Design a protein around this ligand. Sequence first.
Ligand SMILES: CCCCCCCCCO[C@@H]1O[C@H](CO)[C@@H](O)[C@H](O)[C@H]1O
Ligand SMILES: CCCCCCCCCO[C@@H]1O[C@H](CO)[C@@H](O)[C@H](O)[C@H]1O
Ligand SMILES: CCCCCCCCCO[C@@H]1O[C@H](CO)[C@@H](O)[C@H](O)[C@H]1O
Ligand SMILES: *C/C=C(C)/C=C/C=C(C)/C=C/C1=C(C)CCCC1(C)C
Ligand SMILES: *C\C=C(C)/C=C/C=C(C)/C=C/C1=C(C)CCCC1(C)C
Ligand SMILES: *C\C=C(C)/C=C/C=C(C)/C=C/C1=C(C)CCCC1(C)C
Lengths: 261, 259, 258
Amino acid sequence: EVTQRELFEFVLNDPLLASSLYINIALAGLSILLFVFMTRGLDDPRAKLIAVSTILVPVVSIASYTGLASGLTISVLEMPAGHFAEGSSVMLGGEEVDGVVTMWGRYLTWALSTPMILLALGLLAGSNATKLFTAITFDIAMCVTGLAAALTTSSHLMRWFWYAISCACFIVVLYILLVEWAQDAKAAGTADIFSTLKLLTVVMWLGYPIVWALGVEGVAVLPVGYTSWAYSALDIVAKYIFAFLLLNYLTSNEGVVSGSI
Amino acid sequence: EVTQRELFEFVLNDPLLASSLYINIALAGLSILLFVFMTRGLDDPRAKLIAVSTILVPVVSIASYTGLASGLTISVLEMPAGHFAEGSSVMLGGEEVDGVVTMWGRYLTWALSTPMILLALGLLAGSNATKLFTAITFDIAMCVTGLAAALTTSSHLMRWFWYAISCACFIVVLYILLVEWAQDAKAAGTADIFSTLKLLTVVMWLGYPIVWALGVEGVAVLPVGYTSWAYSALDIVAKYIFAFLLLNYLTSNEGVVSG
Amino acid sequence: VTQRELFEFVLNDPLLASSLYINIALAGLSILLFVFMTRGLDDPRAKLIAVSTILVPVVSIASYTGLASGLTISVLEMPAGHFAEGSSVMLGGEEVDGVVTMWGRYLTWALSTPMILLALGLLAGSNATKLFTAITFDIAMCVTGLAAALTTSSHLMRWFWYAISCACFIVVLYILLVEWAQDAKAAGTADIFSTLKLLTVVMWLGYPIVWALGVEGVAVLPVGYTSWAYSALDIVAKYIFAFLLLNYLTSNEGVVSG
Ligand SMILES: CCCCCCCCCO[C@@H]1O[C@H](CO)[C@@H](O)[C@H](O)[C@H]1O
Ligand SMILES: CCCCCCCCCO[C@@H]1O[C@H](CO)[C@@H](O)[C@H](O)[C@H]1O
Ligand SMILES: CCCCCCCCCO[C@@H]1O[C@H](CO)[C@@H](O)[C@H](O)[C@H]1O
Ligand SMILES: *C/C=C(C)/C=C/C=C(C)/C=C/C1=C(C)CCCC1(C)C
Ligand SMILES: *C\C=C(C)/C=C/C=C(C)/C=C/C1=C(C)CCCC1(C)C
Ligand SMILES: *C\C=C(C)/C=C/C=C(C)/C=C/C1=C(C)CCCC1(C)C
């Protein structure tokens, strides 16, 4: 029976939690203003497809993070027997409440932002339509099963099963990035920039399943506030700096990526 | 602990509310029939695409309004401190429940129908895929953040912040409609009808955020029943008469949009 | 009612558990088999058809897990006049009014059918318009079905949603059986549609018939049988049907390539 306001106040009044959240609303807002400014000189429709898709990353981010900060996409959940976070309580409103303050809203940010990042990368890599579809479908699957795992409270073993499935989907995304697009970029004339962003993406994305396993949703070594900053830190690199680097290139090489959408 | 049934009964026994909802279900059904009939002569695959995108609007609208009228997509929400509708009470079942009956289902109508309208306008204007993608993504973000604000009860300020993000998204969609597509239509040879459809669209679309701000979701100068009829009036112009006007042109100019 | 209690309800109930854990297992094995069968495709258009088909059992293993875990199950009280009114079922160790409702099934369908449809549409040389029409109405079919299963305000609303969904059903079956059979002639794939013609009509029609008959509709079938009839179809539609599509595609890569 925890209200949204109660959760909104718990975030505020919790400097660790509030900061990892409000800082991204802020940074997402700046990225947007900056990116629109950087890209206002493009003309080719294909280059502009790469631009709006990249720019949509922080748009999704600022909206979703507002979802978290407002308490709209945060619920309190009790972990199943054997779960390392079973036995937690949090004090909400003015009483102790069993459960863990669960930021499931992060999965909405991901399910809606990762496909935009893959879209921009695939296009930059000159990918055909089959590889984009494969990458984006499995990536979405990865995010949805991740959310399903966080949301599962009936069985501790069930949680880790969703997690495994999500990992399998993640492998498909990684194979496309590391094996297929790495080569398609040579044919597209963007071998080096793609390779840079390919590494950045792979290194950063691998951080998420580790944080999940280590954070409150998993082994619980990282309490709620900390698992949150871990995710917020990854987001800043995987979303904002990534986009900046991608747009920095596109904004100086419009002609290399230009052509039929 | 309000049930779907009590909401279903609350809509009934409420003049303005039931009528503004049940009227749209009826006009949507009659619209679908009239539109199918109007477009039975189409043969060009591209004109048909425009025809079906358009028809999907009243389809979305009848299914969604049935969602509201049935209570499935309605909820009772307590507004935050400072909100003009906080402190409100509503008679549901056998008590005086705290809150405001929230027609959150409306945003499901706008999120699913507006992308179809936009798909209809962009194809008609000869728009390339980049602008359709832009117009449609920011349109979806617009409707979903609008839904987020309506669903926010934690803080009054947050409600107006979501409202702000939703309006910014609205501005992008508008720019494409009035500055980009308006110009693309010339190449497409559909400049005249696009103006008409563009004009009606922008003015009607502007009505929604205005209604939001003045109704129970905003400063509540308009009561629940009244905001509902305001949204219903608008849906009638932007969903049915607008769709009719588009199909009327299309069915008399198939060759122009050929593809 | 609790998620664990819904989860224990399915487990411990042989009929329910087997209709769910069998799909998870068969989907898991189907994904592996499908990926293996398609390891040789070289053409991009063919690859699109294959991954679009492979996603079918991917969606299935996730959604069924969604049901088996209790996440996508709920307990709803049917409205006055509904044949399942007055039902109770024992969940927290006590008597609970209502019917355990597997609404997760509509998620399974809303997410997997667009996928088999795009695979069949492409296979049929369909243009973009018929593909859009098929998928949009198909998704409208599943969403309105879910709405019907979720409506408790009145028994009448439920059937009205059902009619809306059935209307969408025919728009879809039409293009599948008629339109694409024809388009497939130019594509050189009329045969796969001709051979699977009866399989298609029967399995697709089987869903609205199970609805009307099961606890969601007139309820001549209890919950456990309502689940197995849906799960019997899913096995046909999601695994055997996808296999046949893939067996064909793999032997006819060249032609589907164009
Ligand atoms: C850029 C996003 C803008 C949103 C900023 C949110 C910060 C405002 C928080 O408000 C305060 O919250 C307290 C706890 O509920 C109330 O006690 C107090 O009266 C209210 O004023
Ligand atoms: C490589 C991924 C590693 C994930 C391994 C998941 C193992 C977690 C098992 O959970 C435990 O299962 C028992 C039997 O069901 C329950 O009795 C117990 O309460 C529950 O805590
Ligand atoms: C052969 C692998 C298939 C795995 C299927 C997942 C089901 C896991 C069931 O675990 C059991 O759930 C009970 C609650 O219902 C707990 O009370 C019990 O302690 C726990 O051990
Ligand atoms: C902008 C956000 C980004 C780049 C998010 C990426 C998220 C992932 C790669 C998440 C992956 C996960 C798994 C592979 C296992 C299950 C848990 C998840 C969801 C954290
Ligand atoms: C169903 C048809 C139409 C044309 C719907 C249009 C809806 C909008 C233009 C909604 C806009 C909103 C904004 C910009 C701000 C917050 C609240 C709204 C969701 C109402
Ligand atoms: C998973 C594969 C297939 C082919 C699923 C098909 C599903 C349907 C044909 C569902 C149809 C329904 C109708 C027409 C009426 C209301 C309820 C349903 C959603 C069951």
